[PDB]
Scaffold this active site. Structure first.
Site, PDB file in Angstrom:
ATOM      1  N   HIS A   1       0.807  -1.215   0.000  1.00 38.65           N
ATOM      2  CA  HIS A   1       0.000   0.000   0.000  1.00 38.65           C
ATOM      3  C   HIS A   1       0.841   1.268   0.000  1.00 38.65           C
ATOM      4  O   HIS A   1       0.367   2.309  -0.470  1.00 38.65           O
ATOM      5  CB  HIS A   1      -0.939   0.004   1.210  1.00 38.65           C
ATOM      6  CG  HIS A   1      -0.228   0.055   2.525  1.00 38.65           C
ATOM      7  ND1 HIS A   1       0.324  -1.060   3.116  1.00 38.65           N
ATOM      8  CD2 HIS A   1       0.021   1.089   3.364  1.00 38.65           C
ATOM      9  CE1 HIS A   1       0.884  -0.716   4.263  1.00 38.65           C
ATOM     10  NE2 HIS A   1       0.714   0.582   4.438  1.00 38.65           N
TER      11      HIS A   1
ATOM     12  N   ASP B   1       1.522  -9.505   2.205  1.00 36.04           N
ATOM     13  CA  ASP B   1       1.640  -8.042   2.108  1.00 36.04           C
ATOM     14  C   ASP B   1       3.105  -7.600   2.142  1.00 36.04           C
ATOM     15  O   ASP B   1       3.487  -6.697   2.891  1.00 36.04           O
ATOM     16  CB  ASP B   1       0.811  -7.353   3.205  1.00 36.04           C
ATOM     17  CG  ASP B   1       0.531  -5.881   2.916  1.00 36.04           C
ATOM     18  OD1 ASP B   1       0.978  -5.367   1.872  1.00 36.04           O
ATOM     19  OD2 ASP B   1      -0.142  -5.236   3.750  1.00 36.04           O
TER      20      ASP B   1
ATOM     21  N   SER C   1       4.613   3.351   8.553  1.00 37.02           N
ATOM     22  CA  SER C   1       4.458   1.945   8.203  1.00 37.02           C
ATOM     23  C   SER C   1       5.796   1.391   7.738  1.00 37.02           C
ATOM     24  O   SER C   1       6.462   1.994   6.889  1.00 37.02           O
ATOM     25  CB  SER C   1       3.400   1.767   7.112  1.00 37.02           C
ATOM     26  OG  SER C   1       3.274   0.403   6.742  1.00 37.02           O
TER      27      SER C   1
END
Lengths: 48, 163, 163, 163
Positions: free
Chosen positions: D40, D62, D114
């Site tokens: 993302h 991910d 993140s």
């Protein structure tokens, strides 16, 4: 047909080489900040 | 010490960086009413006047050039062709001119410092830095320069890496 | 002096600059619960809350406008229809109001000066700057404003520049 | 106090941010000769060496991973699987490891942090922060970790928001 094709390729290739040599003449003289063209290479290459 | 301060005072207003999504990858040069800018450095001109123009290209000499308007031709760099051997001023210090070749000592040199002009002790641009190659301890530069006749000569050593 | 500092205190909270790629092109005002943005200014509003809101356009008055969210409605500017002659405030010093013409002493006002709200002697917005022209030794402005009926009025002098 | 200084001293050279038009939205991780980077977070790698590679993808776990060259494998993070319960070091202070779950006290946590690895009292990476969910007063983390067998386990609580 084949004579017109040969003549067309020859005239197009000669004009291509003429434009290539005119660019190769005028490329070093235009990058200079003085921006002048000498006497022989002006008229013979249509530089103005 | 003071040489970098003189470079920052001379190249303050006349040097404009090239932006690419916030990254500084190159520097243009405004000299003689002409805007020199390389091919491999791609991005937008930080100046608003110089960005809205059209630059004629020369891929063999690796230069894009344009016409600076008359209201800015007085605020340009100086240029000359008379240059002896020895030392010259560069943005990261000094640069040696030996046998017609520009050499920089190691430690400095990365991707992004392309287009910085080479100055002298008087304040005239003698070369424009385009690339560099690592040679032993002392790297060599791939630059452009002029001559007495008026022909832009591009000097390029073997196996250079574009900056 | 003194006048500009409370204007900076107001503009730090509610006047939002736009984000062109490296610089500031214009200033979005939040007044009365209705976000205002000039058209020739192009970029992104700094707030992610004020960025997502789709704006309606009014080409006669040169302003995009959108609706302010409900939480932001108390923290807006205030607007005034009544303006007497004299002196009003602005981010770049003071502005004269004479015969219905907001004029500014020259030397200031260039690109990136758009959407700055002209305040008053109380802290309320009376006009929004969109540009101006150099009327000799003193520049006039091209603002939108409001009147007693509730009708947005735009004044523009001859041959103004979209700042 | 000194824990944030130890995090800044350990993660100085090995942590590279991800740029997206000047915005810092994520952080990659260089550990074990591998470059971990989430899905993302989209943008360009600030490092010049790590950007000119090809990252194999894993959308279920991910993670994008790549091969760090041999001249940089010594300057990586450390990694282990032996972890007890209790306290661990994180960039904004401390993190609790209880019942196989990472919990962070509230006040901190936004969009952009993140990919920050979780360190211990010795200096080994035990987890990689990918997401977080607000649980009462004390938020929980959605991370990845390893085990004794060698299987990358992705722990994800209910209704997490990606950072």
């Amino acid at each position: 047909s084949i004579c017109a094709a040969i003549a067309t390729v020859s005239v197009a290739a000669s004009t291509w080489l003429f434009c290539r040599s005119r660019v190769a003449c005028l490329t070093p003289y235009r990058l200079t900040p003085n921006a002048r063209i000498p006497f022989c290479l002006a008229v013979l290459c249509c530089a103005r | 010490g003071k040489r970098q301060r003189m470079v920052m005072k001379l190249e303050s207003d006349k040097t404009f960086p090239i932006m690419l999504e916030g990254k500084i990858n190159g520097y243009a040069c405004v000299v003689g009413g002409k805007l020199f800018r390389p091919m491999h450095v791609e991005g937008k001109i930080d100046n608003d006047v110089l960005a809205a123009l059209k630059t004629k290209k020369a891929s063999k000499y690796d230069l894009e050039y344009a016409d600076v308007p008359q209201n800015m031709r007085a605020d340009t760099f100086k240029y000359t062709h008379e240059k002896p051997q020895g030392y010259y001023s560069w943005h990261h210090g000094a640069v040696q001119y030996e046998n017609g070749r520009f050499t920089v000592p190691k430690g400095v040199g990365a991707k992004g410092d392309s287009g910085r002009p080479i100055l002298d002790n008087q304040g005239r641009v003698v070369a424009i830095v385009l690339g560099g190659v690592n040679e032993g301890s002392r790297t060599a530069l791939s630059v452009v320069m002029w001559n007495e006749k008026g022909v832009t000569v591009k000097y390029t050593p073997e196996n250079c890496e574009q900056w």
